[PDB]
Swiss-Prot record, chains A, B, C, D:
Species assigned in the record: Escherichia coli (strain K12)
Record protein name field: Putative 2-dehydro-3-deoxy-D-gluconate aldolase YagE
Cellular localization per UniProt: Cytoplasm
Active site: S45 (charge relay system), Y108 (charge relay system), Y134 (proton donor), K163 (schiff-base intermediate with substrate)
Listed InterPro entries: Aldolase_TIM, DapA-like, Schiff_base-form_aldolases_AS, Schiff_base-form_aldolases_CS
Stored Pfam families: DHDPS
Function according to Swiss-Prot or TrEMBL: Catalyzes the formation of 2-keto-3-deoxy-gluconate (KDG) from pyruvate and glyceraldehyde. May also function as a 2-dehydro-3-deoxy-D-pentonate aldolase. Overexpression leads to increased growth (over 2 hours) in the presence of the antibiotics norfloxacin, ampicillin and streptomycin.
Gene ablation phenotype (knockout): Disruption mutant has reduced ability to catabolize D-xylonic acid. YjhH-yagE double mutant cannot use D-xylonate as the sole source of carbon.
Chief site of localization: cytoplasm
Length: 298, 298, 298, 298
């Protein structure tokens, strides 16, 4: 099983001009590796992939991969609506030294099932890297069903995992039963902090969630306790993770909230976010600070 | 805080003629009280209230309350679309000796917010009993928001709880935060087996869920372990509760599955369900058995 | 084709104490027959079926059937969630002298397709009357697809039409293509005022819509002009029907608006509605008046 | 009022290698101008904007603008998820000689209302050109409400129109009332063939719809009859438009269908579409043919 455990969707740090901030991004990366995470996911939703151009995306992927320097496995989010660009980004990721790619379904047109299967087959066939699917139906408007994901895992042997970003115990349970039933080593990662514990108890593999960025120790220590067989200690961390997502209601998008949390929890970086996201105002930063303090996160 | 803990939505047991089966109903009630439940809820969704006439509802309430004979707190589900009837069913439940009523929002017309607040205020004023709200938006098509629930709890002091039937950590967390923040003794009970653990860890109060009928020991042992500070033990029971809901997929509606489970787990009753529900077939009964066996429930 | 043309969903008139107002209801019935409608539909959504008990429904049906006295075809809405009651209301409608019944799908539980087919088969077999289906997915949360409706028309020969209540050209077109393609005399009536014209141009058969109560001359004259080949005259009435539904925004439910409009347009009746509906306040009554006056309807 | 009447969302013609086909696109352009359209819209949804890179889009806009050579007004679709790119495409379109831009809301993140208002204000402030909004909630997952459109029309005087792409008489009626009530020359165009007639009768201004490509004469002729006060002639064209959208069911996306209809109605071009769209198979091409022949379109 590839890409198991805690694999944060790393924020991309930008300067005030909206250019990749190399020292800031590098420092966040080294904080996360230092914290014991199992891998790093660049250019996911929280990494602002959808607000970046293709060449910006390539430059960021290359920098991120080079800085990591094989210390942990690296995943690159290569999806979008332009399928030709997906292939271009996916092959670039492979050429630059990524260990895998993460591919969301096209989120403008909700393409027919036949087009959807064909889309994922051809992205898969375009690289010889492992491929992880990315389900985010709140944003895409099209759920990757456990049945369709099984079909894909049946069709292509490099389709080996999923980030299932959904607030649903049923979706996760059924994803694990349906797909891991047929494909024992298929990786099921939840996209939400507050589902890591259940995911593990259901027989899934970990999480790619936002709090990996500013509070990686909570998820890391939950996974460690769980693997140790210390279910009480695991559940104590889960109790914190249950409460964290209150801060994501502060703005939409909440990539600004995640970067301000990174700052408040001890890492000085530019908080700049790319439009149409916008800075978190002072009242909502104070609100964030008090929540992080209440959770003993800073 | 009223109605806390494990409060099963008791199945209504009927003979072949579609008439109340008093001995079957009595025996189920007596099984559940013996299992150590904290209360009994009659004529919830799983009790088939929506397939019953007003007079039959009154007959069932009467019989159930009298048999319970004050051994545990009793809730009666009195809602529907006919608000005159809701008031009639509520005052009947009070006169008959109920300890509280559970009231769903009208589920044909999704009435305006002003009509909805008025409805709930009107039914709460019709009785002097405690009133629990019932949120089940998958069936009602209209969610009872934490903000609207708070308004109701501010507005009437006998509106004291909610059964929040939803597969959503966010909805439960926000319910608890919003309403219990304002009303510390307001009772939050989840409607799904697989959210009990999370509900307790979030600061809520228990569950009214289907497995209460055929595996009450699992939720009962979970609540007891939790209240004893033995979180690992509680998590062990949660792991069973996480898996149980796959049986509910066998039919729609799944009131037939619940009764077949009661029989399989050791209580012989007739498993008759009211139209438009229909008998569970032999192949699906066979799948139910092996799931219950796999979970060590029979 | 049975039950074609203009068939108003007649409001039920009640006294201030919430009982059937016989003179008021009889006079509304007589206005509509005088206005040239093709049928009368009692106890539809606008007739407040979902707010009335079983015995009130029987009483209203009997009175309405008797007052009409075979001068136009009479339909009775017999649906609900209690399928045993649907059968008993449908059999009563037949014995009382109704010409057909209109049956909505169960709208609490969205039953499996197997259960849904079985339900409509059972109701259709309980009577030797014409059966019209009622699709209202905004309220039911479950669409009667053209495929499913064709399966029902294939299955029972007394399932002979549908009231399709949806703001969708595509749903109406596909309903007509699919069902009338296999059953040329299956009747398709739209449930909204502003789709009557399109329904006719698409090859369907008329409307059961709210404005049939207070402005029946608009629909009746549209249908007449269309059959006369005076398409420009039809389109002029259509322009009025396009603007009418802004008045329905005044309340939810808007059964109060419909009764107030009957009054405003010349027929003094009591405008009492059953909870959870409530009286229309004086400002919205005035707004309703100004909308009617703008459309030259009073 | 700017950009009224019939403004097709022009197909982008590509060669078998996926590059802009200049002579094919030029021929389509000249066919439409010659058919009497009131303007041309490049890089809408049907123009495959979402499957194209930013540089590809700039090349297409430049070529289409230069080929039209001021013969009719030209709109360019500039939107996407990357707001910085939206501004860059919008400024490029103005510098290239476009008459206006059409801007969809961001369709990955559904941004907060504040972020959404701010986005359209900054795109509008980036150009001195007329701006038309684009509502397509089936694809974006975020409806531009009549109330929000009116707030934008109040805020920026170059925000002067909307393409409202919705199967809804209610949405169109309310859009027209709310926004044109406040701004009499704000232009409301429907996005669907089968709502053109209702749009005009409601007080709106025309259509940007797929059949403008292959059957422009139907819409042009309808608009001409309407403006002539010959409503019966207009309604005869509408009867064809009511039936056209069956063909769009043949694939998702249906950009392939539109180009194959262009070919079947008499203009030989390459019918290549960009992934994740795919070629229409021979069976579905025949089906398209028979549908066009039935409507006397080829």
């Amino acid at each position: 099983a590839l890409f198991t455990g805690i694999i944060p969707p790393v924020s991309t740090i930008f300067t005030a001009d909206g250019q990749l901030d190399k020292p800031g991004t590098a420092a966040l990366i080294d904080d996360l590796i230092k914290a014991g995470v199992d891998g790093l996911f660049f250019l996911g939703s929280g990494g602002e992939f959808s607000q970046l151009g293709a060449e910006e995306r390539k430059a960021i992927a290359r920098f991120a991969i080079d800085h990591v320097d094989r210390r942990v496995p690296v995943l690159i989010g290569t999806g979008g609506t332009n399928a030709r660009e997906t292939i271009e980004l996916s092959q670039h990721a492979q050429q630059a030294g990524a260990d895998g790619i993460v591919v969301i379904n096209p989120y403008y047109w909700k393409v027919s099932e036949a087009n959807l299967i064909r889309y994922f087959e051809q992205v898969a066939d375009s690289v010889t890297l492992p491929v992880m699917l990315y389900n985010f139906p709140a944003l895409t408007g099209q759920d990757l069903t456990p049945a369709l994901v099984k079909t894909l895992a049946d069709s292509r042997s490099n389709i080996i995992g999923i980030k299932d970003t959904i607030d649903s115990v049923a979706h996760l349970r059924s994803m694990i039963h349906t797909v891991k039933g047929a494909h024992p080593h298929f990786t099921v990662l939840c996209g939400y902090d507050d589902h890591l514990f259940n995911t593990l108890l259901l027989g899934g593999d970990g999480a790619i969630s936002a709090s990996g960025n500013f509070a990686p120790q909570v998820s890391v220590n939950l996974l460690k306790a769980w693997r140790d067989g210390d279910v009480a200690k695991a559940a104590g961390y889960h109790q914190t993770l249950l409460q964290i997502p209150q801060m994501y209601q502060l703005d939409t998008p909440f990539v600004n909230v995640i970067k301000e949390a990174i700052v408040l929890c001890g890492r000085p970086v530019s908080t700049h976010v790319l439009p149409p996201a916008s800075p978190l105002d002072e009242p909502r930063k104070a609100q964030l600070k008090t929540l992080l303090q209440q959770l003993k996160l800073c």
